[PDB]
Write a protein that binds this DNA or RNA. Structure first.
Lengths: 68, 88, 195
RNA sequence: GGAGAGUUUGAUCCUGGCUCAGGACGAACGCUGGCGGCGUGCCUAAUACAUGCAAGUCGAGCGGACAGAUGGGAGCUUGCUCCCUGAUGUUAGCGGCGGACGGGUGAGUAACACGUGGGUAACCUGCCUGUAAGACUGGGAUAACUCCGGGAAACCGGGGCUAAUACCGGAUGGUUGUUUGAACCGCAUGGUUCAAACAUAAAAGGUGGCUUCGGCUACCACUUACAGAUGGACCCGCGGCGCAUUAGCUAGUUGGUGAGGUAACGGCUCACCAAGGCGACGAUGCGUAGCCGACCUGAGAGGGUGAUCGGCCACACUGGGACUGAGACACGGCCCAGACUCCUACGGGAGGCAGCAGUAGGGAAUCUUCCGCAAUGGACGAAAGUCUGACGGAGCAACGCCGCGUGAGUGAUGAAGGUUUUCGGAUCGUAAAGCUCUGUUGUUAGGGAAGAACAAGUGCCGUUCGAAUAGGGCGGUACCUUGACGGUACCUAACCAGAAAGCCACGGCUAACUACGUGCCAGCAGCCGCGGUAAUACGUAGGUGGCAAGCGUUGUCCGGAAUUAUUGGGCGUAAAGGGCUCGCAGGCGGUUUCUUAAGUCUGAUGUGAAAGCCCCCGGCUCAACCGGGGAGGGUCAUUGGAAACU
């Protein structure tokens, strides 16, 4: 982060977009199943483009409305 | 320095005023000692309501108002009752 | 909305008709003729609230505060909230008969201009007190919406004094809940919005 | 004016956790988004700032410059050139007052800073009224002006000229101090009043009129005194934090005397002399933070926060000092150093946005480099006026609340199409089409508020001074005149279904389900937990449901959480009795009676400003908002009652 603290976060989407040295915005989300990670990555950030071909769950996972 | 004066209240477009005995050193919405009644500009009719007696006690102590405040007292004869007291 | 597809969900002719229950009492949908189940109190008190709020199309930001505006009112809080949403000006237009639906009464307030003791009122949610007169100026004096609904001579409620061509509307002491709601059960919406 | 629900288990009750429904944001993010009022909009960086503006005002304080042409006269080209001081105009400087308020920010500060109630015999207060008195007689400068000199500039130095309501003496004065008397009273210092004596202590003119030219007069300013009005300073009880894994801390500390010093009390400063003071009711220390009316939440008791608007303190790049002024240790003043920026001809200087905007930078993240002094306000002036980034409005972002839409009636054929299917059908359903419909708004053209009250100048009448019917002063009324927003709100008529809906959920919590895809993989997940081939829990489609110009997620705080339990728990085994004693401090008290009034009870009075909550009206097309009136809020203080209980 920009605090200086290196905390392992989680990638939610159906496949990722991120590579090293990216812009990652983090909301507070508890993952019960995985040991130690308590941070989602906001799919739909400044760098995270939205997941491919998603209609339901539009606000989450950063996809625009496909075509109207 | 002690000017009996108006005090700006109300919404953005349509103002409201309260006639206020205060010190001029405090700001336009600043503090005060004791007030007299009201003023309404946004009514095309009347309803400028004054206590009409309490300020005369303050005028005997001496507190000069601005003329835009003062001519409301002329419309209800506070100053002319006070000028009779100055002629008394 | 559709204003009729939502009442078959409630399973009642909310304006009061013989239609919208014939041939299809199952509520909407493909899971309609698949036989329904029995709900909970939370299942009931939604529909019991929604059998009153879909009468008038009130969005629930405006439905909550009128419940709170009944809170400061004296009397029993259930029957107080019955008074405010039948002193609704949308309902007053519909109870004077010139609207076949309460949704038709919304344009009869919005741009089918109408005069409450003066200039005009474009407010579908004006709280109406006894002692007010309602009329329409010559700009929309007799249009076919009014002309057909004058000819649809429905029964006049007994808290209203209404003439057809004179078009004036005044009141009595209150609209009485015995006259107002035959279908809607009260005292359940209060226990909905107390929680 | 007080809802609960899933989860330990094979099954049950407890116990105990967390989870969940709710309510707010100065909130951000994702997706979308038509409009209108009202309100907010750098919390991190009190980090650095390009550019412009944010505080001047008086020619009626004053000298001079500065234009001026009422005329006068001159030289002639008829084109001019002048020489006098017209009306009047300009104000570098001088001097008067303001700049100490208005405005912002939240860094330090855990203490009389603030909140509340107090006390001053221990104080101050220019500008305000009202009263009491007045305003005598002189003096010496000096800026500007020029004339030189030195400087790159910043600017500086020298020599003459000159003014004032500038400055400085002399008089007279009910200040004050001293000296000596009296009177009265308080709360010790004492206080108040009166007399005498001594000592000094002032002031100013200007504006206009009337003039006998001596002056007079109003008005403004001036010196002094009294009060009131006015704010400020100092002191004091009582309040609102975190840690004992901070128990010892302070020598001007704590005392006295005298001295100085401060508007004022004082170790406030210093000498002397004394050894005290602060402390288990938590000192000292440390981390933390501006406080308060209030905001949010809770059913209340409480808990959280202290943003905007209103009170007060503190700070003005970091630090220290100090002047003039009634008032500062001065936000846009000086002097010094520290960092940094800028300029220099290197000798030298200038600079301070946490003023309005804007930019950098920080960060998840917060707006326009507009117009107006029309209203309110201040500043000065006799006023007009001038000056106003206070304020007035416009502009930005769904940031939030409220308000309005996105068509509406009729219409069965259950159209078409879509989805599903036991292929009969089912649903998307009166939903569309059709017919009818108005125009909020959208669009076009018109009309066009209140905010604006005035000042000022004119008119009178009254009163007041006046040598006066001069001439004013106020007081009344009468005429005149003044809009940034803005032709904006608004209203009038004309136009079209035409401009305009979405996100979230759909096993149980929790309202709502099927079909395909899929096969511990891809993926959901707040909770229990869902998928190793029939996923109502993943993804998609249809269809529902949720709410709406918004919806979800996110971080916060409160609630449900009776899960820190005073109201409102426990302790046999569930978390919990110290291993047991002797006991200082603190805690609690038999019976009867007198008395007292600290607690308690209660009246009265004073006060807890306003806005906000709340009671009730009224205003804005309702609402939101705004206004009027009232209540309420204090372990408050004084005073007077009550005597059972402590």
């Amino acid at each position: 982060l920009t605090n200086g603290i290196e905390v392992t976060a989680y990638i939610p989407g159906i496949g990722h977009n991120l590579q090293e040295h990216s812009v990652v915005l983090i909301r507070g989300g508890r993952v019960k199943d995985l040991p130690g990670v308590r941070y989602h990555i906001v799919r739909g950030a400044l760098d995270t483009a939205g997941v491919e071909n998603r209609a339901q769950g539009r606000s989450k996972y950063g996809t625009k409305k496909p075509k109207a | 320095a002690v000017k009996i004066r108006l005090k700006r209240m109300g919404a953005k477009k349509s103002p409201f005023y309260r006639i206020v005995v205060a010190d001029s050193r405090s700001p336009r919405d600043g503090r005060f000692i004791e007030t007299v009644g009201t003023y309404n500009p946004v009514a095309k009719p009347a309803e400028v309501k004054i206590d009409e007696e309490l300020a005369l006690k303050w005028l005997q102590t001496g507190a000069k108002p601005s003329d835009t405040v003062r001519n409301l007292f002329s419309s209800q004869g506070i100053m002319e009752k006070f000028h009779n007291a100055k002629q008394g | 909305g559709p204003s009729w597809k939502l009442s078959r969900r409630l399973g009642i002719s909310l304006s009061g008709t013989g239609k919208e229950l014939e041939k299809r009492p199952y509520a909407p949908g493909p899971h309609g003729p698949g036989q329904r189940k029995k709900l909970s109190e939370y299942g009931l008190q939604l529909q019991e609230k929604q059998k009153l709020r879909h009468m008038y199309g009130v969005n629930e930001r405006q439905f909550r505060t009128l419940f709170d505006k009944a809170g400061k009112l004296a009397g029993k809080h259930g029957e107080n909230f019955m008074i405010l949403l039948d002193s609704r000006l949308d309902n007053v237009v519909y109870k004077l008969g010139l609207a076949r639906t309460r949704r038709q009464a919304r344009q009869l307030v919005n741009h089918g201009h109408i005069l409450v003791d003066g200039s005009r009122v474009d407010i579908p949610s004006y709280l109406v007190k006894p002692g007010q007169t309602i009329g329409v100026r010559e700009k929309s004096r007799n249009l076919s919406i009014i002309k057909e609904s004058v000819e649809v001579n429905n029964f006049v409620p007994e808290y209203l004094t209404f003439d057809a061509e004179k078009l004036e509307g005044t009141f009595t002491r209150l609209p009485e809940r015995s006259e107002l709601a035959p279908e809607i059960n009260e005292a359940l919406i209060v226990e909905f919005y107390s929680r």
